[PDB]
Amino acid sequence: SPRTLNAWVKLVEEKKFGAEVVPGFQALSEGCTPYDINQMLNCVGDHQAAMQIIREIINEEAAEWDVQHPIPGPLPAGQLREPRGSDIAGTTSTVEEQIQWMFRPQNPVPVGNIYRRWIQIGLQKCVRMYNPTNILDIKQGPKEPFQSYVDRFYKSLRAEQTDPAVKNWMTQTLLVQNANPDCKLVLKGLGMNPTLEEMLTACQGVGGPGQKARLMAEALKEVI
């Protein structure tokens, strides 16, 4: 049902690929044809790193399944083929073929559960590699230009945007919170409720020759 798919969606974004996602997937995918698992994969393919990890893990699972169950001789025409690894993945197998494999009296192959195990291993790998977050990890570098830091912070917040009013406060506070001190001082030197254009045009001298000369001059001033 689409409501279960929405529940898995909110699990995927609300919970950033924690240890609970593997048992959650095993719970949601019970009694699901590989077609339905593909529809589930459609929504979770948004995360590019997780998407490529699950793609490669499914590819290797399918390759080894084909190695274990190859075709040394063509099947007689008019009969359903044995499920290949890609058939388990659901790409080369239609929903009717999968349901026939489920319901065939002669040695049914639970390809749905096999694909569930494949995606379970993929989600395991994703969890083992997935970093905690990125919005709080956006930290300006001492050599990094401030404009690039602002741009990447904006991209990070837009990737998980919350509310137009909330993101204004995000840009108001977290941008200066993660800013390096040389930019931070000119950021705090103006005052309350900064706006993007004026703060950009005011901070666009940090590290430049004028500010280099100013900082060395003042440093010599307390030296002398």
Residues numbered 179 to 208 that lie near its own copies (CB under 8 A) are 180-182, 185, 197, 200-201, 204-208
Q: Exposed, middle or buried by CB within 10 Å (0-12, 13-18, 19+), for 205? A: middle
Q: Contact with its own copies (CB under 8 A): which of 49, 52, 56, 110? A: 110
DSSP 76: P
The tokens for 194 are 């900064």
Tell me the helices (H) and strands (E) count for the chain, helix number first: 12, 0
Smallest gap from residue 141 Cβ to its own copies (A): 5
Query: Which member of 22, 62, 88, 199 binds its own copies (CB under 8 A)?
Result: 22
Count the site residues for its own copies by CB under 8 A.
99
- Interface pattern 24-43 for its own copies (x via CB under 8 A): xxxxx-xx------xx--xx
- Its sign, for the CA torsion 74, 79, 82, 87, is positive
Helix H or strand E segment including 101:
helix 95-103
Quick one: tokens of 162? 């919350």
Site string for its own copies, 126-145 (x = CB under 8 A): --xx--xx-xx--xxxxxxx
What would the x/- binding string for its own copies be over residues 156 to 175, using CB under 8 A?
--x-xxxx-xx--x---x--
Residue 56 touches its own copies, criterion: CB under 8 A: no
